[PDB]
Amino acid sequence: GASKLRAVLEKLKLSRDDISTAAGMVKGVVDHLLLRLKCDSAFRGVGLLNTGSYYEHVKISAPNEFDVMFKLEVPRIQLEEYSNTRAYYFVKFKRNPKENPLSQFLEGEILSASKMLSKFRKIIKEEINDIKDTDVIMKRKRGGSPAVTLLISEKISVDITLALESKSSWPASTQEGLRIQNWLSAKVRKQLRLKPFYLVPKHAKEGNGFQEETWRLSFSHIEKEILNNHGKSKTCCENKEEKCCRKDCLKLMKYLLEQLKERFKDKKHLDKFSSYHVKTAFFHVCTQNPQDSQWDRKDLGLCFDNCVTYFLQCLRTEKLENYFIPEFNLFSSNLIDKRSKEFLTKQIEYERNNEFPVFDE
Ligand SMILES: Cc1ccc(-c2cc(C(=O)O)c3c(c2)ncn3Cc2ccncc2)c(Cl)c1
Numbered sequence: 001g002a003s004k005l006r007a008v009l010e011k012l013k014l015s016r017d018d019i020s021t022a023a024g025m026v027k028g029v030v031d032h033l034l035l036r037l038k039c040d041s042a043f044r045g046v047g048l049l050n051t052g053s054y055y056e057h058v059k060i061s062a063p064n065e066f067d068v069m070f071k072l073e074v075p076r077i078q079l080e081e082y083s084n085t086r087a088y089y090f091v092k093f094k095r096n097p098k099e100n101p102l103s104q105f106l107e108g109e110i111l112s113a114s115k116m117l118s119k120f121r122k123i124i125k126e127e128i129n130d131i132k133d134t135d136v137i138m139k140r141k142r143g144g145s146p147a148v149t150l151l152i153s154e155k156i157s158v159d160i161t162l163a164l165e166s167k168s169s170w171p172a173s174t175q176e177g178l179r180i181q182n183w184l185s186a187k188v189r190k191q192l193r194l195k196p197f198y199l200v201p202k203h204a205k206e207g208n209g210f211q212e213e214t215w216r217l218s219f220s221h222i223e224k225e226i227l228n229n230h231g232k233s234k235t236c237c238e239n240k241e242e243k244c245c246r247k248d249c250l251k252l253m254k255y256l257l258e259q260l261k262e263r264f265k266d267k268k269h270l271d272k273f274s275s276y277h278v279k280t281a282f283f284h285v286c287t288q289n290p291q292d293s294q295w296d297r298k299d300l301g302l303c304f305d306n307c308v309t310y311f312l313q314c315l316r317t318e319k320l321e322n323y324f325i326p327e328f329n330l331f332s333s334n335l336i337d338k339r340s341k342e343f344l345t346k347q348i349e350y351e352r353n354n355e356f357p358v359f360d361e
């Protein structure tokens with residue numbers, strides 16, 4: 001039962017050495033690139049964004065795949081929303097106080113996402129050869145993705161995303177997002193919405209191409225902020241009396257998708273699904289279940305089934321709201337095709353009705 005799930009979780013622990021030394025390798029490379037990007041006129045204000053819930057600059061998103069975010073302070077920034085997509089925006093500036101560093105990537109009033117992403121790639125690619133200490137190479141895509149992808153010693157992959165940092169009020173499309181009021185308090189929502197926010201150069205799907213001057217709102221850095229301060233009680237998991245299973249349910253949810261994605265590797269039906277989809281549904285279940293008593297460590301198997309059922313429902317209805325932007329459907333037909341969503345529903349349906357045989361040893 002939940003005995004199986006506690007055992008899954010015990011075995012996940014055993015591979016923390018591998019992820020930790022992998023993440024140190026990523027940390028090295030990342031620091032070297034940060035040194036050089038700072039040499040450039042355009043990126044001298046660049047720095048690493050603290051996003052990871054265990055490792056500072058390195059978020060883990062797959063067994064051998066890491067996510068790192070470089071942030072760039074871009075002051076006096078004005079947002080024009082692309083075609084009511086809610087998540088995708090054109091970036092302009094307020095005036096010409098004094099000509100800014102980034103003016104090389106302007107096109108009229110608009111800052112091109114692809115033009116700035118392109119000089120980002122060039123600087124990384126030139127630095128990727130020089131330090132022979134470790135063999136790292138670049139990988140393909142560059143299509144409707146903000147990520148520049150390195151492969152380190154042929155095993156470890158790291159996605160590097162440029163992120164404009166805006167200190168302004170969050171845009172209106174997030175007005176009704178981050179619905180933590182009943183869980184973490186209205187006071188905590190007010191403070192989190194005072195933190196900055198980010199724009200990453202992911203490009204909207206237009207027709208069968210991309211609109212590659214659009215940026216996408218990013219709130220990745222809020223995750224650590226809630227994962228590690230996750231209870232209704234400020235002292236949740238700080239003493240032996242308040243031990244919940246919120247973190248273990250998220251760990252189990254990610255592992256479930258990882259295993260399923262590994263098993264349907266033959267015909268790639270599940271390519272488009274990622275741990276981001278699982279985190280989003282998880283935090284939506286923390287919203288439905290706001291009391292620390294709804295996540296007692298003794299109830300692990302039922303809290304897990306709460307998470308799998310909500311995820312299942314999102315797949316069946318083809319609707320998973322962006323946690324920060326409610327009108328942005330992570331599961332729209334535009335983003336994931338209808339056959340894939342159907343495919344995962346059948347598999348997660350099956351796993352759940354059979355007490356997760358994918359977890360068997
Ligand atoms: C409470 C809470 C806090 C943060 C996130 C969150 C947000 C973002 C985001 O940038 O929007 C995340 C994220 C987690 N992992 C990755 N990305 C970035 C991203 C960008 C484009 N496509 C997919 C993913 C969630 Cl889901 C819940």
Ligand SMILES: [Mg+2]
Pocket residue numbers: none
């Ligand atoms: Mg331990």
Ligand SMILES: [Zn+2]
Pocket residue numbers: 230231236237242243244245246
């Ligand atoms: Zn807790």
